[PDB]
Amino acid sequence: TEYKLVVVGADGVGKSALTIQLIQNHFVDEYDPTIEDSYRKQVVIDGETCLLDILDTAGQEEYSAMRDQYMRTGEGFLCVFAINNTKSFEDIHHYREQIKRVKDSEDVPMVLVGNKSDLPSRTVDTKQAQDLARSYGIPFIETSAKTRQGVDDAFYTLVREIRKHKEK
Numbered sequence: 001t002e003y004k005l006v007v008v009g010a011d012g013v014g015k016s017a018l019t020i021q022l023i024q025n026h027f028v029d030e031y032d033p034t035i036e037d038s039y040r041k042q043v044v045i046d047g048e049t050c051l052l053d054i055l056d057t058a059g060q061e062e063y064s065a066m067r068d069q070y071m072r073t074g075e076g077f078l079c080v081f082a083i084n085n086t087k088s089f090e091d092i093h094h095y096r097e098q099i100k101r102v103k104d105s106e107d108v109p110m111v112l113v114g115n116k117s118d119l120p121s122r123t124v125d126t127k128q129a130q131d132l133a134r135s136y137g138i139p140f141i142e143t144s145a146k147t148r149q150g151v152d153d154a155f156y157t158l159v160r161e162i163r164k165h166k167e168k
């Protein structure tokens with residue numbers, strides 16, 4: 001039923017666009033980059049009604065004790081980079097290690113997301129992202145918030161992952 005998802009990623013990669021697409025089915029062209037906020041979507045995934053509580057983490061860099069305990073209640077994570085930025089791909093490792101830290105676990109459900117797949121300025125290879133996703137034991141998804149491609153499939157896969165982490 002309830003699954004706390006966290007869309008992590010560097011400023012700009014389209015975490016808020018991928019949030020507002022899953023929740024409202026439209027491309028927002030200007031969501032405040034200083035606004036970090038949570039959003040729930042009741043969707044039915046594979047027979048089971050699921051209240052996905054998605055946190056779009058997007059503000060300033062803080063690491064308070066409050067924020068640890070907060071991201072430790074996050075059960076699953078979308079590591080969101082943009083195909084049109086390399087720093088955004090190199091930041092995916094950083095996000096994964098903050099998750100491994102706050103979760104005290106090597107085995108936390110994650111899904112690599114190569115956002116902005118519609119732009120013709122690919123700087124991050126699909127092989128790279130598959131290589132980075134195969135080293136983590138996580139699925140890799142290429143998405144487009146502008147065109148919703150892979151959006152559902154991304155968040156849905158993450159919950160399928162979280163489903164598989166619970167039967168373990």
Ligand SMILES: C#Cc1c(F)ccc2cc(O)cc(-c3ncc4c(N5C[C@H]6CC[C@@H](C5)N6)nc(OC[C@@]56CCCN5C[C@H](F)C6)nc4c3F)c12
Nearest residue numbers: 008011058059060061062063064067068071094098099102
């Ligand atoms: C996330 C998360 C995160 C998790 F998944 C899990 C647990 C966490 C527990 C924390 O206590 C705290 C976090 C946490 N919260 C906010 C961060 C952040 N703010 C700044 C901007 C860019 C995103 C958004 C959010 N707005 N930015 C960067 O890291 C980016 C880089 C780029 C410049 C320097 N830093 C150091 C690294 F090299 C990479 N990390 C952040 C971070 F860990 C956590």
Ligand SMILES: Nc1nc2c(ncn2[C@@H]2O[C@H](COP(=O)(O)OP(=O)(O)O)[C@@H](O)[C@H]2O)c(=O)[nH]1
Nearest residue numbers: 011012013014015016017029058116144145146
């Ligand atoms: N073309 C395209 N632009 C995107 C996509 N996702 C986000 N953007 C753009 O990237 C900019 C910043 O994205 P935002 O959602 O603010 O990312 P955040 O700062 O990581 O939350 C926005 O102006 C969006 O128009 C996408 O899939 N395709």
Ligand SMILES: [Mg+2]
Nearest residue numbers: 016032033058
């Ligand atoms: Mg944002």
